[PDB]
Amino acid sequence: HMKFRAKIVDGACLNHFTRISNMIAKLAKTCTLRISPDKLNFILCDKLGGVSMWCELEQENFFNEFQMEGVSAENNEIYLELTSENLSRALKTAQNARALKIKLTNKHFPCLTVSVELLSMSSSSRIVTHDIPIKVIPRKLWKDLQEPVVPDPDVSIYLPVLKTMKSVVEKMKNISNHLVIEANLDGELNLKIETELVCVTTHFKDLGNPPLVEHMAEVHIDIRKLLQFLAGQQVNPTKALCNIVNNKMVHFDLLHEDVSLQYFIPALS
Amino acid sequence: DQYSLVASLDNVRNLSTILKAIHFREHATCFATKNGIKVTVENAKCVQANAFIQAGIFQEFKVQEESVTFRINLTVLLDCLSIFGSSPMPGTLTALRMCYQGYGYPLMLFLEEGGVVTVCKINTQEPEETLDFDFCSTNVINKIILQSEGLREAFSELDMTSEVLQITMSPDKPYFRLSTFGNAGSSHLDYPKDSDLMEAFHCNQTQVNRYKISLLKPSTKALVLSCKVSIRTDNRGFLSLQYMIRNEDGQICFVEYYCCPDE
């Protein structure tokens, strides 16, 4: 008898959650929500181009009420697959919300039901209810929903202003969908596209590197995936790190307001 | 430094904006001379759009020959010129340094914003036959100049359904008339010669010419950025539209549209 029931009564929290939801709705059409006693993770392990995304929330930073029971005491977790825009559309009016309730239900079929109690001046407030269709993922499939292992990065560099990067890759994408991203321990990072009739290279410098030769570590990637990740970030993150594994993968590690986001983009072909 | 052409701008927008006014073809021909740069795009013998940026607009501008010409992909060119975004903020400029070594070499762009530097290598092509519409002020039957600002809304509401746009200019009423003839609909746009918008009116004969409207549609881009526009037709029936555009530094630049009549 697995179950989940949570509530948010704090305005700032309700909005923070909503923003995070709008974000993953950008990074992936479909995602998996992992529920634990103290956390909530949004997971995308779509292997193709096997780009992965791992988002983690600390339940206590959002909910004033939180309760769940996994499949079994031993493995006290729950994995629900859902359509991202569904969760965003549900949080659509949370701007004028007094409270938010989320609860795993099974009326017509399994759903994550979200109830938004709108702000009111009387004793009776308007209520918006949304029944989000979810698919419970069986324990056997949980293995393919674990956060990717982080092989030590050849280079780990602080990322530049994301809005600026977005603009640049936005335009580069109009020229090619292949992109080379490179960086070094000297605080330099370059974005590069090369086609027969036009080449473009954007040089970022004085970026800094985290403690612990200056040849660069590079990696060829699908530009559309880099655009996706950047398009998702609504604001420049507190801590934003780019970790590259020469010719193998770029790994982004963001930490904005106690909410970490790990995006993984593998090399091409 | 054997560079046929070298140019610089503390503000790329003093170039990218004008170039966007004539961006309806993927390719354009660049013509540089001691006096400045002329970019031209053509639509197969029917339409020609030219943008001219006088050398005085640039901070650095030098040509090492009598004239230098080359063809480039305008779309890529504009994509690179706005590599840093299209919504810059006050006090946030993107500078440009253009370099074109010579025949057979790529156009090089160097842009920097906030210290970030973008390098662009845009291959050049062999120019092609560039149409010649010699709109001599001695061939001009009628000429008119309007205040661009108040024509934008109206001009964007031209029934694109009709395949043609008919222009009427005359010393008699109506003075200046644009007419369409679309799906079960005849429509007319009239501007009186004594209008506040009418800064100059010199029609000494009644002319009525037709043009395929879709050929004239792209002329809207230039209209939006201009502050003035003069309209002229000649004895052949060709249309000439000259747009006066003021850049961010108050300097003036012109865009010109020529269109053959429809028969």
Added chain:
Amino acid sequence: MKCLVTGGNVKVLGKAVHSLSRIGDELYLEPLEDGLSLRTVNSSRSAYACFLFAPLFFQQYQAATPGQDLLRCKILMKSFLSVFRSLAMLEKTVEKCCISLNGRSSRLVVQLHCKFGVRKTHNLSFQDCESLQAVFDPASCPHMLRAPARVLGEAVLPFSPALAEVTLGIGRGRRVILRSYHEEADSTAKAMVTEMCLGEEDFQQLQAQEGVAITFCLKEFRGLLSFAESANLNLSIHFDAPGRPAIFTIKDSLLDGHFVLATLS
């Protein structure tokens, strides 16, 4: 027939048309004694809309046209909508709008008198026809509701702009319920359902039996809502049982509007 509009009334006439273009493909026009009547109907004849602009809505209103006539005509909604397409260009540049017709004329003339002496003339073609009518009686409807359009606008906000049908129903405590409706089959791709439960105090009037519920076209309702919200007017809904039509009404001092929508059986 001659109708001359000025001031803000030009912009409101434009809105009425946009709002009408969201129901039917043909615009029916009847200059009546008590006002200009603009009507349209569904492509399936399941929706009916009508706006009646009282005489004082115009600066000059002359229903009768010289020559053997008593005008009743239909015009391509698209052609008429193009005239008022840009509510922006209206609000700003347009000062006067004059709609005219002669007995020996073949086209309907709409002439916008714009700033700086600019003038735009539209010659629309029309077809003489019979008065467009529908059958419905609000007075015999057992249930009705009345609330400011702004409020219903908020009631419909949670749903998707693309939602086709919606269910309106009365709950206990006199709570009004709006629920998204869909079709289809024990297949996957089950749709998310949204429900909005409104307080009783949100309605100026509510006379319906609990458990009562009807489903209708939201895309079409929104046509009347948009016009009503902007004009900040109250909206009434008169309905019966599933299968009978739902009647949506608004009433200003210079105009009347009715949208008669069908309900699933």
